[PDB]
Structure formats: structure tokens, C-alpha cells
Design a protein around this ligand. Sequence first.
Ligand SMILES: [Mg+2]
Lengths: 300, 710, 707
Amino acid sequence: MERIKELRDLMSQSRTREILTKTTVDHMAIIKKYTSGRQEKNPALRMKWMMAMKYPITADKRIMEMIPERNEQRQTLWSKTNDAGSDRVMVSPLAVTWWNRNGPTTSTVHYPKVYKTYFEKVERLKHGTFGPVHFRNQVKIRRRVDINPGHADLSAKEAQDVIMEVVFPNEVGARILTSESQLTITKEKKKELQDCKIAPLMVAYMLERELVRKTRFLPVAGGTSSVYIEVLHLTQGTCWEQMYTPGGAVLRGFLILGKENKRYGPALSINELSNLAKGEKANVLIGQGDVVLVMKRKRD
Amino acid sequence: MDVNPTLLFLKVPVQNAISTTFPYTGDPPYSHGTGTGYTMDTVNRTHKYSEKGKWTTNTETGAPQLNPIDGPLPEDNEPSGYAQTDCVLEAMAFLEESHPGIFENSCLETMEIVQQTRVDKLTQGRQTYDWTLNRNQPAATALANTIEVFRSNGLTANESGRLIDFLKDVMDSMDKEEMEITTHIGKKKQRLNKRSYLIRALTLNTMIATPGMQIRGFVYFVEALARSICEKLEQSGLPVGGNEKKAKLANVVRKMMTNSQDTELSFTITGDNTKWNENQNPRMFLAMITYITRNQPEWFRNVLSIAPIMFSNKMARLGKGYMFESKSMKLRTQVPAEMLANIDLKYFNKSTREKIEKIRPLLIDGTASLSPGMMMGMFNMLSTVLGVSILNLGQKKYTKTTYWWDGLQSSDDFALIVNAPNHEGIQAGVDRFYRTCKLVGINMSKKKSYINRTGTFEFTSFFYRYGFVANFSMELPSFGVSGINESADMSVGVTVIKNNMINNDLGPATAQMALQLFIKDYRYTYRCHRGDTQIQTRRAFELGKLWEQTRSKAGLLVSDGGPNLYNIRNLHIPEVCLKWELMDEDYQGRLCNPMNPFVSHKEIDSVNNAVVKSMEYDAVATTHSWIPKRNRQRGILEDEQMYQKCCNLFEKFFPSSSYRRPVGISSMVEAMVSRARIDARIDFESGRIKKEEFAEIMKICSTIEELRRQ
Amino acid sequence: MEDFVRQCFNPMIVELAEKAMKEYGEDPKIETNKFASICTHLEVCFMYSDFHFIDERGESTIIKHRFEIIEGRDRTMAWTVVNSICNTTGVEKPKFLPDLYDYKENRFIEIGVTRREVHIYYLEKANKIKSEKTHIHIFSFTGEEMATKADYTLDEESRARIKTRLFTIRQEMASRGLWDSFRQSERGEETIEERFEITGTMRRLADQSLPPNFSSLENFRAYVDGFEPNGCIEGKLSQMSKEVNARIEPFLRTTPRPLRLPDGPPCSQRSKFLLMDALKLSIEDPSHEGEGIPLYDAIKCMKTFFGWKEPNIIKPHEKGINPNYLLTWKQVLAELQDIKNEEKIPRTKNMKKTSQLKWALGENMAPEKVDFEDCKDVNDLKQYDSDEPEPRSLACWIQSEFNKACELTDSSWVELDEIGEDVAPIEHIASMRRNYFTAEVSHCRATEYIMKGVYINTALLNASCAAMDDFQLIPMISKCITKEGRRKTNLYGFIIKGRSHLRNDTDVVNFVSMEFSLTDPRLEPHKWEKYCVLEIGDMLLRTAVGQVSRPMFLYVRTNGTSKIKMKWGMEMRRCLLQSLQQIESMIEAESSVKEKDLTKEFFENKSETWPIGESPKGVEEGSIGKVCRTLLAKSVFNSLYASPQLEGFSAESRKLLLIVQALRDNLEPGTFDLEGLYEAIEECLINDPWVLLNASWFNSFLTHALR
Ligand SMILES: [Mg+2]
């Protein structure tokens, strides 16, 4: 496969081989920050300049299999070129509009589920009620208020735990596999997002947004509840107050028995640990690539 | 009748109509005011303001160094740098006395920060002077180049992943006899002796100036300590935001006025410090850091003291050089500053002649030695700590007289308030504050400061008038397209308008006008004019076809030629969700198709977040979430993308690395090989990979393991 | 680190570690690595001993504790218990303190938790402590383990629990960024405090960075450590001379003086296009074939005018070649006629490179670059001229320009986009306020300037990107809505753009602008020093006496624009926002005072007035609409005439304005170096007409406010 061949190619050269063999999985993130690029100063002017070009957008390789080269008016949608560093072909906004008006249609059923917070915002605004405006001196006291309503008030650590369990089931670390009980929210989200083609990174980001608690230091002149903070712009002002009412298997219990033991067979994956027996000891790749010998928790 | 807008102040008070006194709304299109002559002028002025100090020659760099500390006390009102060590130590002592335990808690918090920090933090800075390339480079590139050179010189402590280990490597390198630099052109080797390397590591490239990678970590730790100190002071205007500054101004004014008796007299000084950097001495910072870190582990004291020690022997590069033009033959040539030391003085004007004559003795290897003074944007929080100490020295239990002062200090700016029984009391208090500032090395700009009865003043462009505070530190922010993409730009624009309405006193009608102008700019920039309009654009045909095809035109996004449904009501709602109920089924499916070739997500830090400061915007990943095209020599790294090339191909093995920072004991290659083997086995077992492919993959894995072992 | 240790370990274990480390007088808050090491060791001890018992037959049963703890007690108690075990069971006395006593095997077992490799730790322990009849079990955070003779006392289950606990602790430490220090802090058998020493070069540098009367950084540290405040500040204050003071000089009514404007020849026009002298050829309804594209509209607009005659120079450019400009205009006319007779008008017209156009656009007109050593001996070589710019006196043409910019035009110049339907009552209030402001501002001449600049700069940027190396012809076009509501397209002139190989955001593209006008330059030649003006035609103007002929001139000049300047021009619509913000702030202040919405009482009043102008009679007052238009024109002229002088003058004169305001409030204002402030304000007035006009406005305001 392209991935393993590219790994071999990287390991061929001396410096890349040394960095791969030396840096541990812990320090990977560190070397992720050694970017050789350059952020564009004043990206607004850069965008204004680009949009006057012919092909300022970067699609991927597969676009050429679906979007035709030219439309009815013979305007070229994408060009047989490449970006500066990858095989991302050059395309034009005409291609985006062509996809939006003629591209394949799918079923957007998971979008309300994944973006639940935004649609909850919409529903709260839709069912709200409005009162008269009162003009007078405004004295807003500044205090810490919550930002996102409907959250589970989950700790960032535990929110990340749930996100890893749901989005990336077969990359959970030793802590998850060694735990005794599974949170109900995790199972509910796993059932809710079974067949979800949305990018797993987007799903993880939305889950973290919807499960973590966030607070900000804001002035307030009326209610302090979270539902009253999202509409702070609409309700309170410098010299006016607007009266608004808002409208709203079990892969756990495993003990590590040391490092990889080749006598016990090839390393498995987490997702297939359910097929083990009551006391069978196997080799599993946990975390981001750590092979360990594991056994089921017999004699709880 | 001759129109005169200034006459509007005859009725509207200036503070109420202060907006009319600001000429621009956004960055002006010249961005000028810097150059080599400017750097030489700053060096000359800094040395002049302390010329009565003691001269010495550095035993390592052999550079003239001026020490005005404990110098003769000033005899005039001109700027001076003759700060007294005892006076500053006493100011720190009284600051601790008024706030017992502040220094100890701040030191403990900074120790926690130091132990848990990481090297990649240094990649978060601005353009920095790479000594390996001897020019300005990006922070990440400079860090990578320095690490590569250190590794080539047998310095690898930074491989532990901690910034403090990188600092240990930096010190060891400062103790290296020779340094080798290899540039890949093919290959090329250069050798630097101890003195040359020290000079390079003790430079500040001028372009205001920027330090090299050898001082970024120490400065970072010192500023962390200063931030911890400042967070516990109510008289410090740093690093709070715009919402926490109005509260402080109002509180201080109320404290100094309402507490005043019926016979007490209160006055307020709006004050700028004339230089505040060319008179701040690194020795004073070292003294006050030594006092702050009393009774601390020796390693912590040493780490915190390295920064002022390093800055006390800093060097300043003189820039590009000079431009010479001839009239007879219309000939132009560039003279680098390096030769400026060994050139005659018949091509430069009188003022430039004086500048070069003054700066010649201070230069070594093209860099002027600048021991005294400082540069803005480097030790802002330590200077704020010193200013707040002076402010706190105004309590009635320290003045021992009827008059007493209090106020706010924000790095360079300050607002003072003096209460005394009578006018002579106010004058005495002002004189005492000024003289104490002079003793500690702080100069008040008499021309940029003024006093008046308490009730009206200004502080960091916040104008206070009888309780009404107008915030103009930053005026109307940009109300156009940020330049990320269509969805991100729409979300950012609406969110920015909403935030300005919430915080920056933006009115409803002004918000509506801002929304209208932003929508106009968005449509013109992205050519997404309303489908029914007859404006001719390269994107007009597709948008018109989409408009005619659709049934519910209200559901089309603005980027798709739809109408604008935004108002003050729904600035907090993403556009995709705002008109989700109005979208046609097929159009909704096409727009929200996860398999489209346009959507793309980078690491989570860059997901739904844009760097301007960083602001998070709410958006739905759609077809409009594309990426603009990328746009783009001596080099230490043969392959400048090696780090990215390695980090990439790890997300294809462990996708969670994109969302979470990975943790593991094994090396990257070993983990990747294990995952490859497991995936190949599972796929071959499932029956969607054949014997040939499986064996082929097993064969590459074996040779990769052999390569790693070898 | 300490927080993680406290929140991870069992509180009793934390207390045991705290007491054990206090026994040695060590501070956990200052040495957290040792604290974590002791906590891990004690937890491993407990888990080793936990969940074990001895049955009635002496066998080991998992439910007398099988293991007796020895490391969880004081030295005295540990020694007493180990001696009791040795006496009761007759076991050899261990040389060093053991950790656990095994009843089933009747021996002493010691456990070592190693951050490094297990074999190294085992070898060190064997060569250090192990003497005789002592078992060693070495555990690691990576899951490994080792023991003597590979005889592990516990069952696989308990060892699995210990390994899992250690692995989890390792993972949590790594994720929190504490594992690096924790692993680096182990040296053989002990945990060492962090070390960061100053030596060698850095030590000498530190010794060279002290006050004058110090030689060693250690001496300075010792002095600071024992320093106690003893009236040092008071003594130094009593010593310094009294000439160092901040004396407040009163500022009452006579201290301020008029700002001194620079003396010299009058200032000239530097804007990118004509403002009040602009003449536009207009088509009242663009309903022609291929309409909308600039070139066809420009051709149609030109066709509407009859009376073109042979061009000739009227006002030559003193520093320029007038025949080149004349030939450029002739070439533009010839190309327009050629495309007109072609009947195949293309979207964009690229001009043919010509000597006149090559010179006018500054194509290749630049000194050649050479090395200094190659031309060091040239007699005429000198540093680039950067002297003091020549001061210029204020002229009345800029005031007339501003007066014109503030008055209404007969037709509307803004067609802002739409927004969602208003629902909240505050939304209705905002809509009413915005509509009032728009009605006051829609027909202003400043709006015309805004649209003109926006269109010109948008066209220039698009042409520069599209045609990098072509001499494009760009008509200067604007759109308008007359009183009758009919769309009208106006053409002001043409711009020929040169090479646009722009890579940075500051490199300049040079263009030639030729603009129609009716004003004779000879009336105010000083205003047109940068322009070459030719008489290009004749026009008929209507008046009470019929039609009168007036010459029609063409102002031709060469200019340059960068990407940043083009973006600045395209973003001119924010002047509307600025003016609206000020006008709305006034209304909101009044409403807060009166506790009710006063939009009607501000805009429909037409009786309340604000001082907005000066006449020979005195100060003049205008309605709210006049104030809106005046502020919009001020913003527009600030945008058009931006310069460092303008921002400097604004920043410096804000202080003087606030001092005067404090005076007007009877707040007893006072200054320290008011002459310095005056010098700072006046240093920013050299030649810019806009800054000089602003200075004159400030002088007039001072005169009127002081009285
Ligand atoms: Mg100030």
C-alpha cells in the first residue's frame, strides 16, 4: 500500500530514518511544530488578490473523476496542475458551484446530530418571545458566565476520553481498556454515530464543543443563565435593554502483562479484543502504537 | 460658509466626539518609520542618556559597556538612566510589604511553568534572528535550524522535549570553543570561534528589533514570572483585556475621589514615560529579579537571572546598510553596514556623519554594543512591576505627609491621582513621585503628560469623563473578509460584528451598517453576487444556473448566490444552520456531502479557529470549506520538510494524532510498522486484500525493521 | 506535578509520603520528583501486600496478612518489627532495611520501581544492597519486571495489576508533560533535585553584569539576600538637587497660542483622481449590447459627446515631457476608434507599447544597480537625497474641495445590500436610525468619491492580477441613480496600467491617469504642478441665457499604486461606518439622558443645530444632516489624504484638544512642557494640504472656544 511504501521511502534516507527511530511517540507532537512554511501577513489582501486568478482553490486528486473539465459555457473548472507541496489539483470557484448544483446528493441525517449545538441555538431563537425596549442608563456588572448551554459539564480530560472512545475506538490508551465501567454518554454517542461519513476530526471537534464547559468574563445587566448569554448582543446595549425570553462489545477490564510476547501470536487490534476467551492472554496494539500483552480481568 | 468639523467640539465634549480625532479606520497604507539610521540614532540616544556611567570592556566580546547604575543623581529634567540599586531594592521590599507573599507565590507558579514547558513553545514567536543563517527567519524554522546545528555540534539535551534542556544546551554551546555550520548548493562548511558565536548569540536584529533563539526561552520564563507578579496587582494594567480595564479605571477614580474628604483636593495626571526603554537598565532588572527570587532553589534563581544577564551584554545589528546614488551616470549601489566601520565619511550628510562618528567606537563585527537601555516589547511586564511598585510607594504610610498618590501603570502609559489638602500639597506629591521615578530610573514625558482635576483623564487610549469611559485602544476592526474561505469568512464576519456589539460599544444601527458593508465586500470578493443580479463575473453563469434550478431560493447560502438573512437577531447562529430548514433536499445533500473533494481539516488547533490573537468561529463543514492555494538559498536542513514529512504519514497510521497529542513508549517507526502489520493481517483475513499484496506488505515491513535495527 | 500526585494517589498514601519526606526535612512543594517517587514506591508496596492472606494450613489464600510491611513505618518501628521477625523466625539480620517480609517463604523481599531499564536497576541493587537471603523484585513503568531466579512470589494476577497501575501512571504523566522530568530525575537509586548551574562563559558574563561596586554574582546575591530597607529612598531624595522637579504651569485662557503653519509656496493636489474638478460623460440608461463591461460602457459614454477637437498643451508639466502625454491621449483616441470600427469590442483593451507610453509609465526608467566597490571613486556619488521636504503654505483650494465634498449631489451614490427582516423592536429602531442616516448621506459628494475610488481601485487590482505584463486601458467608471430612478453610468477618464509583476504588497505598479475636466488650470496653476493639462474639446453648458461654450480639458499625470494602496482604496466604504458610529453615539447619549428613543427628535427635528462651520458673520450651525455629511466628508478626505503627517498631527493635537476641554470644564488643567507639545504638533505640518487645513481648523476652534 502507498502508506507502507512511503514509510520505507522515508526510512531509506538517513536523516528521516534517524528522526523516526529516535523520536518517541510522546515527542511526535513536538516535531509537528517544526513547520517550514510561512504564515501570510494580511491574509485578506492575499485572498482579494487570489480571487482575481483563474484557479485559486486547491482540490484533491479524485475531483477529476467527478467534476468535468468544462461546463456548458466551456468555462474551465479545474486545471491539470498541482499545489506547492502535494498532488492537490488547482480548481476554481466555478467547480465549487458546479458541485453544489450538480454534484452527487447524499443523506444529511447525521448533520443535526453532529452539529446539535448549532441547531439547538436555532431552535432557541425560533421559539423565543420579545418584549419592549427600555431606554435608560445601563450599569452592567462584569462576571464570569457560561458560553455553551446544553453541555454535560464534562472535564476536558474526560471529554477527550469519551471522544477517543467514540470517534477513534481502536486507539484508546491503557487507561480506557483498564477501566471497569463505560460511561453511558459514550455508548449513546457510539450508537448515534454508527454510520457517519463526516470527517472524524470534525465529529471529535463538535463533540468536544458540546461536552466541555466554557466560561468568559462578560458584562451583564440582566439574566446570567447560559441561554441568556448567547443573545447578549441582542438583549443588552450601551443605553438600552431589550426584553427577550429564550425559547429553550464491552472492551473494558483488561490487565497488562508486560511487553509483546511473540509466543502468544501476532498483535491484535482493540476492536477485535471481544473475541477473546475468559482468561486468554493475547497481544494488542493499544494507544498510538504500543504492543502489550493483555488478559481479561478474571476474579474481579 | 467654510465647513469646520473641529467646531463640533464647541457643543459636543471632546471625549464624547473623540472618534472624529482618529484619522484612519484600519492600518494605514504606508507602514513606515524604521531604518538603519533609526537604529544608530537609538543606540546613540541610549548611550547619551547614561553617558556619565562607568565604561568597561567585556572580557569575552571585548565590547564597550556602560554601567549607569548607582551613578550620579540627575541635576536636570532630561532623561536619565542613573538608577540606584538601593532605591530599587527598597521599592521591591515595600511592594512585598504591601503585598506579603506575592513574590513567593509567583515564584512557585513560575517554577511549575518552567518544569512543565516544552521546546515547541519557541515556535510561537514572530520573525526571529537566525544566527545560523544570520538573518530573519520564521520562529519554527529558526528553532529547527538551531536544533540541527546543536546536534551537529554534539548538543542534544533539547531532544528531551523540555525547554529547560534546550536552555542547558544553549549554555553549553556558549561554552563551546568552536561551532560548525553546514549549509546544503550541495554542501558548505563554516567555522565560528567562541567570540564570534557569542556576538551572534548576543544580537538583536533591527527591522522593533528581534532576539535570536538563544534568549527566547529565558525571556519567556522571566515574562512568565512577571505575568504572575502582575496578575496579583490591582494597579497593573497588564495583561488584562478591554473589559477588565474600564473596571480598574472606574474603581481607582472612585477610590481616590469618594474617599476624599470635603476639604481634600484631588488631581489626576495622564502621563507618558518619555522613553521607558532607553533608560531601563538590565542591571536593574537583574537586581529586582534577585530580590523577587529570594529564598528559592538555586536552579530557579539562575534560570530567571540568565535573561537580564544576557541582555546586559546585548548587541544591535545596524540593518541593511546604505544606498548611494550618482547623478552624472545615474548609478546606484548598496553599501552593507558591515563595511560601514571601514569606510570614509564623504558620502554621508552632516547628520549621518555625526551618527556614524558617534557609533563607530561602539561597533564590533558590524554590531553596535548596547549595554544600557532596553527595547520595547521585551520586558514590558517587569517594567510594569517596577512602575506599580513606584505607584504603591505613594501610600500615606510611605509618604509620611498629607499628600498621597495612587493610580494605574500599563508598561509605558500611566494614570496618577494625587490627593492633598491644598494645591501646594498636590505640587509636592507630584514632585515626590517624579523624583522617586527618576531615582528608580523612570522618566515621565513632560510634553506628553498633563494634569487636571480628577474626573477626566486618559489611559492607553481609554478616555474617562465623569464616569463615561470610551474605549479607543483599538478602533473599528476590519469589517471585510478575513481570507480563510467562504464559510469561515462569513462566520468570522458575523461573529466579529456580534462581539463588537457585545463589548466595544457598537450600536445597533452601526452593527446593521457593518453587516451590510461586510456582505457587499464578501459578495464582491468571492464573486457570489445574488443569482438574479445581472453583474457579469466569471462565476455568474454557474450561480445563475444554480439559482434557476433551486426552488426555495431563501435556503441558498450567500456564497451560493442566496439572500442575506442575517440581522441583529441571529448574529450568533451559523449560516448553514440558520437556513437549514429552507434548503432544498438535493442542494442540502450536495452542499453537505462529506465525500466532496473540497472540504479539508488540519490539526484541531486550526479547526474552526483563525489567527489574527486567535478567535474561534462557528461553522458547518461544507463544500465551501476549501483551502486557498499556497504561495512561495542557504539552508541548514537538506530537506526542510523532513519533520512534516515524518509527522505526515503518522496521521495515516494513527488518525487520532490529528485530534489528540499521542503518547507512547516505542519509537515512531516501530509503532507505524506494528500498525501496518496488524492492518494488513486484518484486511487479508476479511478477504479484501490478496496473498500477493499481503506478502508484499509483510516484505516491506521486514526490510523497514531491518533498516531501523541497522 | 504536585497537583497530579495529590489528585492521583490515595490520600492515605499521600499522607504517608508526606510524613516520610518530612522525616528527612524535605519540602514536597519544592522537590516534587522525590515526592512522586516516594508515593509510587509506597503504592507499589501496598499493592504488593494488599489482597493476600494466610490460611489455617499455612498456604497462601487470596480473599493473617501474607506480607508484612516494613517501609511504611518510622525507622524505629521498622527496625523493631524486622528484629521481631528475625527473632521469632530466626532469619539472618538484613544489612539494609527491607521493604516487605514474606511469611509463606519466611524471607525479606525488596521492591524497586525503576524509570530506566530493569536490568540496570537490578544489577545496581544486587551490587549495592543484596547480600544474602534477600529477594529483589524490580518493576518498571513500561510493564517489564525482574526478580532473582525468575521466581516471582505473587500470582500473575497481582503482578498484572501492578504493571497496569505503573503503565497508567506513566501514560498520565506523559500526557501531562511530567514524565520527562520524572524519568530524568532518577540516578541509580535516588531522585535528585533539578540542577541548572552557571559556569564558564556564562559565569563571567554574570560577574560582568552587576552594579559598579560588585565583582561576583554570588556577592551581589548575598548583598540582596540580607538587604533591609533603611531610608535609602528618603536619603537619595534629600540628596538630589531641587532642579529635578515636575512643576505644574497653569493653563487657563492665555497660555495657548495659534499653531504655526509652515511658510513657503502654496501646496498642490496629490490625490489619485480629481475630486471637485471631475467632469463625467454620462449615459442615462445603459441598455446596449454587451452592457456592464467597463470598455463597452466607456465607448458608449464617449460616443455621447460630440465636439472633440485637435488636442494641444495648455498647462505643461514642468518636470515632464508634454508631447509624450499628448501622444498618449492621441493613442488612446486612436485605439478607441479602432475598436469602435472593428465591431468586435473585446472585454479588455491592451494598449500597444510605444515610446510615449513606455516613457510615461516609467517602464525601464530606473538607475541601474551596481556594486559599491565598482563605483566608489565617482566624484558625483552621494547618499540618496533624504533632506527636509520643502514646506508649503496652505492654499484655499483644499478648503473649497472640502466644502464641495460636504454638499448634496442631485443623485444617489450608494445601493447597500440587504439584511434579514426586522423582528425585535430594537431591530426596528436600528433600521429607522440607519435609514435616516442613509437618507442624509446617500446623495453626498463624499459618497461619490467613495464609489469612484472603490471602483477605480477594484479595476486596477483586477487588471494587475489578470494582465501582469500588458499596457491595459482601464476606464474610470461609476454607477448612479438619478432622482427619476434611472440608472446612469458616468465616465471620468482613463487609466493606462503598466507592468504589474507585483510580488510583495508594497512594490508599485505605475499607471497614467487622464481625466476629463471643465476647470481651467491657469486659474490655479500651483494646484496642478504634477499635472499636464491639454485642451481636448468643447462642451455646451445650459444657463439662463441659453447654451454657452466652455473648453473641455484633460488632466494627464503619472502615478503609482501598490497592492496595499489598492486595498486601502477599495475599502473606502468604512467611512460611512465611522460617520454613522459617531452620529449614533450622539443619539444614544441623548436617549440615555432622556430615557427614551430620540431618533425622530434628532433627524426629523430640523431645528436643533450643531456648530459645523465658520463665516465672516461668525460660527455657523447646521442640522443633523449637515453634521452627518461633514463627518462623512472628513472621513473620506482622511482616507484620500492619508500620510504619516496626518496621524502624527491627530495624535499630538488630541492632547491639546483634551487640555482645552478640561479648561472648559473648570477642572484647573495644568501642563509640564506645553511648549514641547506645541513643537511636537507643529513638527507634523510640512506640505500636506489636508494636514494644514486641519491645523487651520484647530486654530479657528481654539479662537472660538477660548472666548
Ligand atoms: Mg497616557
